[PDB]
Amino acid sequence: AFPPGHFKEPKRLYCKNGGFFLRIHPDGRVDGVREKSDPHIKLQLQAEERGVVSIKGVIANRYLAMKEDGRLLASKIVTDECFFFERLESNNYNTYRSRKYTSWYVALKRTGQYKLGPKTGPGQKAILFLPMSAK
């Protein structure tokens, strides 16, 4: 389990699959960008209960949501589609698995676009994100 400090400051989430930071855009898009100075990659993780987080784009003021067809979008309201199991894997990257659609992961393709839920799964580079300082 992650300590209280994990939740005290914003983070960038760096994806192993292409080196994209996860971006939540004010325009509702969720995608990846390599540029570390992009304003929309500063994210706030919030614990909903032990091991479960919501992921909010600070500048966008929107929360990451995974829909029933597996799309990612950024939602103005917190709904049950906005909660993810946060787990540290053995390679020291984390995964974020939907608490609602429990086989599917937050993921980015090598193109930078999100990867649809039904195409995700354990062991893929697409699902691995490293939290780091947002400074």
Author numbering: 20 to 154
Paste lines from the article:
Based on the calculation by in silico predictions, two FGF2 mutants with four-point mutations (FGF2-M1 with D28E/C78L/C96I/S137P and FGF2-M2 with D28E/C78I/C96I/S137P) were finally designed. We successfully solved the high-resolution (1.40 Å and 1.48 Å, respectively) crystal structures of FGF2-M1 and the FGF2-M2/SOS complex. On the other hand, SOS was used as an additive reagent to promote the crystallization of FGF2-M2 because it binds to the heparin-binding site of FGF2. In the crystal structure of the FGF2-M2/SOS complex, negatively charged SOS was bound to the positively charged HSPG-binding site harboring K128, R129, K134, and K138 through extensive electrostatic interactions. The RMSD value between the structures of the FGF2 mutants was 0.144 Å for all Cα atoms, indicating that the introduction of mutations did not affect the overall structure of FGF2. Both of them adopted the canonical β-trefoil fold, in which two sets of three β-hairpins are arranged with a pseudo-three-fold symmetry. The structures of FGF2-M1 and FGF2-M2 showed that leucine or isoleucine at position 78 were sandwiched by hydrophobic interactions consisting of P45, P58, H59, and L77. Thus, C78L and C78I seem to allow for better interactions with neighboring residues, which prefer a bit more hydrophobic and a bit larger amino acid; the hydropathy scales of leucine and isoleucine are 3.8 and 4.5, respectively, with their volumes of 166.7 Å3. The C96I mutation formed a van der Waals interaction with the methyl group of T98 at a distance ranging from 4.1 Å to 4.7 Å. The introduction of isoleucine at position 96 in the FGF2 mutants likely dictates the orientation of the T98 side-chain. Subsequently, the S137P mutation demonstrated an improvement in FGF2’s thermo-stability, as determined by SDS-PAGE and CD experiments. It was also identified through the crystal structures of FGF2-M1 and FGF2-M2; the substituted proline residue at position 137 forms CH-π interactions with W123 to stabilize the β10–β11 hairpin, a portion of the heparin-binding site of FGF2.
